Ligand SMILES: Nc1nc2c(ncn2[C@@H]2O[C@H](COP(=O)(O)OP(=O)(O)O)[C@@H](O)[C@H]2O)c(=O)[nH]1
Ligand SMILES: Nc1nc2c(ncn2[C@@H]2O[C@H](COP(=O)(O)OP(=O)(O)O)[C@@H](O)[C@H]2O)c(=O)[nH]1
Ligand SMILES: [Cl-]
Ligand SMILES: [Cl-]
Ligand SMILES: [Cl-]
Ligand SMILES: [Fe+3]
Ligand SMILES: [Fe+3]
Ligand SMILES: [Fe+3]
């Protein structure tokens with residue numbers, strides 16, 4: 001990752017860990033492990049995959065006010081301020097990552113930005129991060145084990161399954177559903193037919 | 194303003210033509226929706242005739258052939274994306290052209306409420322909401338939580354709208370069926386009522 005960050009993995013782990021709780025940093029390590037496994041399985045650059053996965057939740061624990069300032073400074077979209085952390089920590093978090101690290105790679109940053117909501121046409125790296133986040137080994141929740149099996153077989157099916165489960169979950173709790181989420185939903189459900 | 198004022202047929206002639214468009218089971222559904230929409234109109238201070246008429250006509254095109262719909266799309270509202278969907282989406286949005294072909298109805302409120310009865314919109318009129326809810330709670334319906342919808346409809350029409358839309362999004366997602374984007378526009382607009 002030094003090629004991407006200018007830092008050894010040891011300073012990098014220090015920086016990431018100092019942004020979040022123990023429990024969350026373990027999640028992030030599990031996501032790194034899972035993304036590297038997925039990259040191996042699907043013929044993708046393991047270093048890009050692991051680095052995007054290590055960084056993906058870098059901003060997860062920023063406060064609302066800190067996000068509102070990053071919005072104002074870097075992407076002042078009126079609608080964006082109506083949402084919250086779930087949406088912000090990836091989409092707006094990338095600005096924090098760039099402030100704190102010498103990361104410029106647009107593939108990595110884009111995979112991080114959309115890790116929560118996806119998009120239509122996700123790249124292989126986007127999908128690796130998206131799926132690793134859901135299936136990493138510390139996770140236990142309704143839908144993970146089917147997700148793990150699918151991931152071993154077809155990345156696009158895993159993407160579809162994860163998205164369908166998340167929409168169902170949000171709807172069951174009457175929580176707002178980000179419009180990109182439904183874009184991702186409709187684009188990938190054909191894989192499950 | 195009677196059904197005849199709106200359509201040029203009296204309710205008796207309407208009921209025959211509507212019966213002709215569909216199976217008995219569907220026609221009974223439509224009578225149930227008419228009944229439910231009239232009750233919702235009384236409950237919420239809305240014109241009972243408009244509500245009853247929109248309800249009677251809402252599924253006029255439910256059993257048109259796929260080919261009839263595609264012809265209608267070409268002829269009246271060319272949209273290649275629309276063509277990618279199916280009966281669920283078409284029968285309201287494209288069905289209103291069939292209704293206008295067969296009936297002398299021009300009322301834009303009634304037509305708009307029929308057109309969106311499946312998917313809703315973000316800024317639904319009272320008539321829109323009455324048809325949308327009546328469709329879901331009509332007395333022939335027997336599905337889990339229909340009694341929750343019925344109860345909410347007795348108390349707050351916007352909540353009933355919110356509940357129905359959250360139900361439908363969760364139902365579709367739970368089996369990985371496509372979700373029409375207006376459906377999510379309705380969902381996000383009405384969930385704050387819950
Ligand atoms: N309100 C809302 N929440 C979402 C949407 N998509 C995902 N989420 C939620 O965002 C939360 C965090 O998602 P994610 O970044 O994927 O995982 P995490 O950061 O490792 O917890 C989860 O509770 C998801 O349900 C959406 O479209 N709208
Ligand atoms: N594909 C798709 N189907 C939907 C959507 N919203 C509702 N439906 C379905 O369309 C069907 C017809 O719905 P509706 O016109 O409300 O009821 P009906 O005509 O009395 O059966 C149902 O099975 C709904 O779940 C959507 O957004 N996308
Ligand atoms: Cl680990
Ligand atoms: Cl590696
Ligand atoms: Cl599971
Ligand atoms: Fe996250
Ligand atoms: Fe995560
Ligand atoms: Fe219908």
Ligand SMILES: [Fe+3]
Pocket residue numbers: 222226251252328
């Ligand atoms: Fe109906």
